[PDB]
PDB file of C-alpha atoms in Angstrom:
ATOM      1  CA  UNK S1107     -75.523  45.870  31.327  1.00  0.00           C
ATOM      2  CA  UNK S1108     -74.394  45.992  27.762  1.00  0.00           C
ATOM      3  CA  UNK S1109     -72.301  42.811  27.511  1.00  0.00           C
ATOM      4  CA  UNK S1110     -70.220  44.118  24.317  1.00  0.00           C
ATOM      5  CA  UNK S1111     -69.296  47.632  25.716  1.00  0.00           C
ATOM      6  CA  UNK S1112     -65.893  45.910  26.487  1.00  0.00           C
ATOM      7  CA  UNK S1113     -64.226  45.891  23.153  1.00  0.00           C
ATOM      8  CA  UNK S1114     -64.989  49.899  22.056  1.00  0.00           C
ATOM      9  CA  UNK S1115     -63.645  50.850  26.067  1.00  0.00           C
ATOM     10  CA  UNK S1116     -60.510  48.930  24.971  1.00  0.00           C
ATOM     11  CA  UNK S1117     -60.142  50.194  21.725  1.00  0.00           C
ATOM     12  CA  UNK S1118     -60.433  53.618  23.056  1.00  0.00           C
ATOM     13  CA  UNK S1119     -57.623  52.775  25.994  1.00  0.00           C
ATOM     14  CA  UNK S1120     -55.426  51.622  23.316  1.00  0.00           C
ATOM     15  CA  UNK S1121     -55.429  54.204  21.290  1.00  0.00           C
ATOM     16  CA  UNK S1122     -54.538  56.542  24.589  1.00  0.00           C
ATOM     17  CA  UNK S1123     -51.874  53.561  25.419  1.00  0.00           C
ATOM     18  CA  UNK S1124     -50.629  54.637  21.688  1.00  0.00           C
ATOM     19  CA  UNK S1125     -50.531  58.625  22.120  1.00  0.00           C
ATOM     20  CA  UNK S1126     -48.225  58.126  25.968  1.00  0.00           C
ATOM     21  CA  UNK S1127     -45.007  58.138  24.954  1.00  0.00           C
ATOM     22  CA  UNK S1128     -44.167  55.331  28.120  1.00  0.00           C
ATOM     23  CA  UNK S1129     -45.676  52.878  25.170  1.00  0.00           C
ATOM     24  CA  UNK S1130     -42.579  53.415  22.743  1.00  0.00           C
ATOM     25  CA  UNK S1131     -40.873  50.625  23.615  1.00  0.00           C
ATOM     26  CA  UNK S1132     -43.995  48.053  23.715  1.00  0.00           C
ATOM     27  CA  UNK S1133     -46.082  49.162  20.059  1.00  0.00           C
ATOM     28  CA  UNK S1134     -43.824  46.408  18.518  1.00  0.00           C
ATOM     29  CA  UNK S1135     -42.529  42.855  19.279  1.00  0.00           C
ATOM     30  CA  UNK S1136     -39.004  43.407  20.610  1.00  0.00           C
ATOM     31  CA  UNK S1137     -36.432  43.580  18.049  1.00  0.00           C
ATOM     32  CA  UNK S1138     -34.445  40.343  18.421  1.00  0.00           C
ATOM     33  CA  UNK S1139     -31.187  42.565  16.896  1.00  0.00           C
ATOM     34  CA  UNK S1140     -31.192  44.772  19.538  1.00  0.00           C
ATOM     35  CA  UNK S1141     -31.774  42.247  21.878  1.00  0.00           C
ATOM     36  CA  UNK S1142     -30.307  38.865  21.124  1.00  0.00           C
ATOM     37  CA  UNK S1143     -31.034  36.962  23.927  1.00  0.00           C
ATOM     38  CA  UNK S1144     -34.598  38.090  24.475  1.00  0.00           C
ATOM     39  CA  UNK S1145     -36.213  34.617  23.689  1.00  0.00           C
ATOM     40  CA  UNK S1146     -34.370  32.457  25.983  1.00  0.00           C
ATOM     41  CA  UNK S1147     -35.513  34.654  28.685  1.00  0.00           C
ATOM     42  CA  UNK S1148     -39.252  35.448  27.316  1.00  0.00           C
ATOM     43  CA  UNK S1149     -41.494  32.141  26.089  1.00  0.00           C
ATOM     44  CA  UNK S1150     -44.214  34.605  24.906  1.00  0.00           C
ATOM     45  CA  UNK S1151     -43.209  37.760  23.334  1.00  0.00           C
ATOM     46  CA  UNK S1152     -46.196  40.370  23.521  1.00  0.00           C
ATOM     47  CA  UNK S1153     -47.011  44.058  22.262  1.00  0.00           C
ATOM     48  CA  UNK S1154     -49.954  46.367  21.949  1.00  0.00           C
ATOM     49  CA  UNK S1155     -49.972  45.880  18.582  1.00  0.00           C
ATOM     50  CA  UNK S1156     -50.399  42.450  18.665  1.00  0.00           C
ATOM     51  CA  UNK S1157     -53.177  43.399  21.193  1.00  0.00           C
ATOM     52  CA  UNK S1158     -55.020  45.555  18.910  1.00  0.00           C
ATOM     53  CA  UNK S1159     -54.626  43.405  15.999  1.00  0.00           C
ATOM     54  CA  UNK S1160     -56.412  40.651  18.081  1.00  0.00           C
ATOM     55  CA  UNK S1161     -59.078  42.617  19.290  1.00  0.00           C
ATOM     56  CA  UNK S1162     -59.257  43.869  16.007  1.00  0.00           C
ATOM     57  CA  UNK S1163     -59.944  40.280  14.289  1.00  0.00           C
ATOM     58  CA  UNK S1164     -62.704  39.237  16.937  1.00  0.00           C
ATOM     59  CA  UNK S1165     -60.489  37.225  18.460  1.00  0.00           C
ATOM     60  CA  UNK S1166     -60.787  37.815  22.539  1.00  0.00           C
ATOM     61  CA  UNK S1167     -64.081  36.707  23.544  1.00  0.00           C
ATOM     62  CA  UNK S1168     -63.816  38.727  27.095  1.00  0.00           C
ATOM     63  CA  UNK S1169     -61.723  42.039  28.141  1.00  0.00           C
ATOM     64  CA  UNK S1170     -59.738  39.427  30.975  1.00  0.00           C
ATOM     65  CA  UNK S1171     -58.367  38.103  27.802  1.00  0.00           C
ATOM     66  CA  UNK S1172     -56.991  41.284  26.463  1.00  0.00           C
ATOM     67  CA  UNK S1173     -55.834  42.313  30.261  1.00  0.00           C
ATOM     68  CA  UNK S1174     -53.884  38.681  30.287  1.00  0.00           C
ATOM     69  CA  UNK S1175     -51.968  39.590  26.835  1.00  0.00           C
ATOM     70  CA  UNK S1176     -51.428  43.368  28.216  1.00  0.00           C
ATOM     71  CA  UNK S1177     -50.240  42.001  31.548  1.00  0.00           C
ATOM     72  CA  UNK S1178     -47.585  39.713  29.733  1.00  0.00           C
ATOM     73  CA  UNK S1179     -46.325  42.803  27.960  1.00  0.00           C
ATOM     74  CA  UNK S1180     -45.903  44.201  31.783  1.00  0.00           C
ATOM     75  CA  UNK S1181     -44.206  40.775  33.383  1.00  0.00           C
ATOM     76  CA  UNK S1182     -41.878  40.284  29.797  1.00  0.00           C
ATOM     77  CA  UNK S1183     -40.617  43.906  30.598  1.00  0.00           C
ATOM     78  CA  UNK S1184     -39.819  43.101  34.147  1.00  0.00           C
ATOM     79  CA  UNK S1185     -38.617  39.463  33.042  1.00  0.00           C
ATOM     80  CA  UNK S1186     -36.088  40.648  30.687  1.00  0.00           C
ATOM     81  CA  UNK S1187     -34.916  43.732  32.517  1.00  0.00           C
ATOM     82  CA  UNK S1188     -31.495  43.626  33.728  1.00  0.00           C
ATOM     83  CA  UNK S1189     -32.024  46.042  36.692  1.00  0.00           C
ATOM     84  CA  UNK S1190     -35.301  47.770  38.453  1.00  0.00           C
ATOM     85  CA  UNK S1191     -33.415  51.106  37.798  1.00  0.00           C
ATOM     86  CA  UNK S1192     -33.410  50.546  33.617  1.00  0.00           C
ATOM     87  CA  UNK S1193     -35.245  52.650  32.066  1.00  0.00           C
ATOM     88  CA  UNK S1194     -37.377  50.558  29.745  1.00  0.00           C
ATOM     89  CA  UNK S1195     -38.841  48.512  32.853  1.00  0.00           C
ATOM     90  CA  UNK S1196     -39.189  52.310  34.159  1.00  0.00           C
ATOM     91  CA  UNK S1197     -41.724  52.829  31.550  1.00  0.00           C
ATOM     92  CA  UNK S1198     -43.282  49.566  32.062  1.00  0.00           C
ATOM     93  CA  UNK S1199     -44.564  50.765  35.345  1.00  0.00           C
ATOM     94  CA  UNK S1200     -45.592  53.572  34.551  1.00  0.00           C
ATOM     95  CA  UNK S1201     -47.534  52.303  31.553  1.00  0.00           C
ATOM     96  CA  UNK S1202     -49.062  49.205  33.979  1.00  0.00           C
ATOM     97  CA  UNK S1203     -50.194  51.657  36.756  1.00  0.00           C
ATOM     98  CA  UNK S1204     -51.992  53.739  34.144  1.00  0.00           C
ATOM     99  CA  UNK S1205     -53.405  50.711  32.241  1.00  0.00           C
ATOM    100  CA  UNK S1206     -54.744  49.612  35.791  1.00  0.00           C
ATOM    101  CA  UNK S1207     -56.169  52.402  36.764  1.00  0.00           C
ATOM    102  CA  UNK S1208     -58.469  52.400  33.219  1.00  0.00           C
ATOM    103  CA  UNK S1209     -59.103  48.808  33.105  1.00  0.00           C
ATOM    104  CA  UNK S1210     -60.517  47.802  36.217  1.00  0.00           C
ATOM    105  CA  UNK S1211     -64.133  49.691  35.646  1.00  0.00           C
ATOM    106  CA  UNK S1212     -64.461  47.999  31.836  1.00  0.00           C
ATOM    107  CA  UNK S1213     -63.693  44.595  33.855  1.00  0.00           C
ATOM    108  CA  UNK S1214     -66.148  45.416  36.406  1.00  0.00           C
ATOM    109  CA  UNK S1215     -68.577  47.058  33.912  1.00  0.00           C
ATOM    110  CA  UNK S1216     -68.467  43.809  32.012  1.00  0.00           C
ATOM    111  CA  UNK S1217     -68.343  40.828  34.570  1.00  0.00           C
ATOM    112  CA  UNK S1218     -71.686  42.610  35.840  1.00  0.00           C
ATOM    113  CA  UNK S1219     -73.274  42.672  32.574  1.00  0.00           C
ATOM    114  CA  UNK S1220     -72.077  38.799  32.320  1.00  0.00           C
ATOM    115  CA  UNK S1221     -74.087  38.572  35.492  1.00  0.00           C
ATOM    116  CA  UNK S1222     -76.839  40.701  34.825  1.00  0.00           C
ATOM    117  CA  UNK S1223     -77.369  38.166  31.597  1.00  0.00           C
ATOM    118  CA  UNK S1224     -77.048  35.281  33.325  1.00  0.00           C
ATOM    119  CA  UNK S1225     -79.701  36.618  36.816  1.00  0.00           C
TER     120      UNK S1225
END
């Protein structure tokens, strides 16, 4: 029922988001040289660093906020790709299913200690 647990669970999950090389592609904001184009596709550009350096500052109150940012990294890649075959968007899902997979007990962990607060 410990209602700040969230943020160290995260920064931990980063950091293994950081060591798996299917993250390459996503520690930075996309490199608008390589990619010309990329902003009149994507209306908000997103990265795990940007994540971390959020989290970082105190600034998500909740983990569903840092699951929101991570999720647009997720729907940018698929947004932008060209095909389901490329192999950035490849990464992607691989990188999503394994986010998933981690984040859905520090949501649940944390929307009961909410609740547990609030009895």
């Amino acid at each position: 029922y410990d209602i700040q647990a969230w943020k160290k669970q995260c920064e931990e999950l980063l950091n293994l988001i950081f060591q798996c090389e299917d993250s390459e592609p996503f520690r930075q904001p996309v490199d608008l040289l390589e990619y010309p184009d990329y902003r009149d596709i994507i209306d908000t550009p997103m990265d795990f660093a940007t994540v971390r350096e959020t989290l970082e500052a105190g600034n998500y109150e909740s983990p569903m906020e840092l699951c929101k940012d991570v999720r647009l990294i997720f729907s940018n890649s698929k947004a932008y790709t060209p095909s389901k075959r490329s192999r950035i968007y490849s990464m992607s899902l691989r990188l999503s299913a394994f986010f998933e997979e981690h984040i859905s007990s520090v949501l649940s962990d944390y929307k009961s200690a909410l609740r547990f607060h609030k009895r």
